[PDB]
């Protein structure tokens, strides 16, 4: 049994992959909807990797998920075969 607290972005993991894992685990978490909102508002940025965390903090709390994805595109990457 996993916990949302256990979900952290990998050192080179694409932000898009991490958000998907965060979402899947949060859906299964046993907590109120109000708490799930708070977990998303705080833990998603807090448990991002250092390079994405910097970017997300700069964007600020008004940013949309789509905007966060665009800002973190290619961080850790670009993940093409050599």
């Amino acid at each position: 049994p996993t916990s949302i607290l256990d979900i952290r972005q990998g050192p080179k993991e694409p932000f898009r992959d991490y958000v998907d894992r965060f979402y899947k685990t949060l859906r299964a978490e046993q907590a109120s909807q109000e708490v799930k909102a708070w977990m998303t508002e705080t833990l998603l940025v807090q448990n991002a990797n250092p390079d994405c965390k910097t970017i997300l903090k700069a964007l600020g709390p008004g940013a949309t998920l789509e905007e966060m994805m665009t800002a973190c595109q290619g961080v850790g990457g670009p993940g093409h075969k050599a």
Binding site: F22, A37, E41, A63, L65
Partner: peptide
Amino acid sequence: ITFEDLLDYYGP
């Protein structure tokens, strides 16, 4: 962002 934002993004 909120949990509802994740639901919208990956859902309905």
